[PDB]
């Protein structure tokens, strides 16, 4: 049945116009109400706005309805001056509603069809490669561990992978942070026998594709 | 904005488990409340509206009820398809709006973190600012404390923690809290520590190195 697809650019300039369009499929596109929710990094679903298929009509949140804008195959959003703050996924959506009487009066929206969401960031840094730094310790114990500090690159996202891929064991790649410079940095950990840090070499493969950056890292006792 | 409030924040279950959770509303909204479900990277699905009607396709375990300011969702006999993050949401008005959600996780046995400190690579000193990294590896459950101490003092700020989701295998997690600095402040300070609070420690570990040795 219904299928709902979002697209548009993932980087948007502060101050510029954030345009994300969904394709509507497998249904009469007239004949429901689509719209727009968004979720920001660490923060909660937020409705932006429904409107309605066959007319264009619908309503839009209080707090976003001053630089917002829906339009309808397809829907469209365009979100005018945009922040940081506007950095989320953005949801297509069906929005359902039900008469409450009795009386002329609406519910508002619930949302019976999502699409994937489409990432979208708002920043004004350019692209740029990581940087890659060893983390390194330790016989005493018997397992030690080792690491690679990604960090200071933009867009995300970064691959990690440890002795081209032959290690996998025990790694764990944190979620990128985003710093206050604009930029991102995560770490690559895994842990490993102590025995071994003296025959084996360890080495963080590095992979940045919006800059074509690759980097692979010995790391080393120190 | 009405406000909508879930609790718990997180809660850990086992499959088999009977699991209920609360959404509370600042104001009535009689029964228009739906459910969601979403799990890591996917799209949200309703799982009930109108507070208590099943969503088509949406499994019998799943039931909601309440009216009014007061609503529950039950899972019964919990399956492994049903750790996710649940979200409720009320559209009696404009603008309808979300709970923050409900993380519903695997519970297993207690385990320590086993802690680690890395001093900067001598490179990062050379760059002028320099990252301190301590990580917090195969622990659960997920609440665990980290304090900074620079020369036993307790730093504050210029620090942020990153957790991985819970292990598809081992289902615990691990955590990094990494504190930026500027060299000029790294070098004012000698001795860099990470102690670590967590349920599967009888007593605070403190893992630590000597700047420059």
């Known amino acids: 049945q219904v299928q709902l697809q979002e697209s548009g650019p993932g980087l948007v300039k502060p101050s510029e116009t954030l345009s994300v369009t969904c394709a509507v499929s497998?249904?009469?596109?007239?004949?429901?109400?689509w719209g727009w929710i968004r979720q920001s990094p660490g923060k909660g679903l937020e409705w932006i706005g429904t409107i309605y298929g066959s007319s264009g009509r619908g309503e839009y949140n209080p707090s976003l309805k001053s630089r917002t804008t829906i339009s309808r195959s397809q829907i469209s959003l365009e979100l005018t001056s945009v922040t940081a703050a506007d950095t989320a996924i953005y949801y297509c959506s069906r929005g359902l509603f039900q008469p409450n009487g009795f009386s002329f009066t609406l519910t508002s929206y619930w949302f019976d069809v999502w699409g994937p969401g489409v990432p979208v960031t708002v920043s004004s840094a350019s692209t740029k490669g990581p940087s890659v730094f060893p983390l390194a310790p330790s016989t005493s114990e018997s397992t030690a561990a080792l690491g690679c500090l990604v960090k200071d690159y933009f867009p995300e996202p970064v691959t990690v992978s440890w002795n081209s891929g032959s290690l996998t064991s025990g790694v764990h790649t944190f979620p990128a942070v985003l710093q206050s410079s604009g930029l991102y940095s995560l770490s690559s950990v895994v842990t490993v026998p102590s025995s071994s840090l003296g025959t084996q070499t360890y080495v963080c493969n590095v992979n940045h594709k919006p800059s074509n950056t690759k980097v692979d890292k010995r790391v080393e006792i120190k | 904005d009405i406000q909508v409030t879930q609790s718990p924040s997180s809660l850990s279950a086992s499959v088999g488990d009977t699991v209920t959770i609360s959404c509370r509303t600042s104001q009535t909204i009689s029964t228009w409340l739906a459910w969601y479900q979403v799990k890591p990277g996917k799209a949200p699905k309703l799982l009930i509206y109108t507070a208590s009607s099943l969503e088509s396709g949406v499994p019998s375990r799943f039931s909601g009820s309440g009216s009014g300011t007061d609503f529950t969702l039950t899972i019964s006999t919990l399956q492994s398809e049903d750790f996710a993050t649940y979200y409720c949401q009320q559209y009696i008005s404009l603008p309808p709006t979300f709970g923050l959600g409900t993380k519903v996780e695997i519970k297993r046995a207690v385990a320590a973190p086993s802690v680690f400190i890395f001093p900067p690579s001598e490179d990062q000193v050379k760059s002028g600012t320099v990252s301190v990294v301590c990580l917090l590896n195969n622990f659960y459950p997920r609440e665990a404390s980290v304090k900074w101490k620079v020369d036993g003092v307790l730093k504050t700020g210029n620090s942020q923690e990153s957790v991985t989701e819970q292990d598809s295998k081992d289902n615990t997690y691990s955590l990094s809290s990494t504190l930026t600095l500027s060299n000029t402040d790294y070098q004012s300070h000698n001795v860099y520590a990470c102690e670590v609070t967590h349920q599967g420690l009888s007593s605070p570990v403190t893992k630590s190195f000597n700047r420059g040795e």
């Open positions: 497998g249904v009469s596109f007239s004949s429901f109400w």
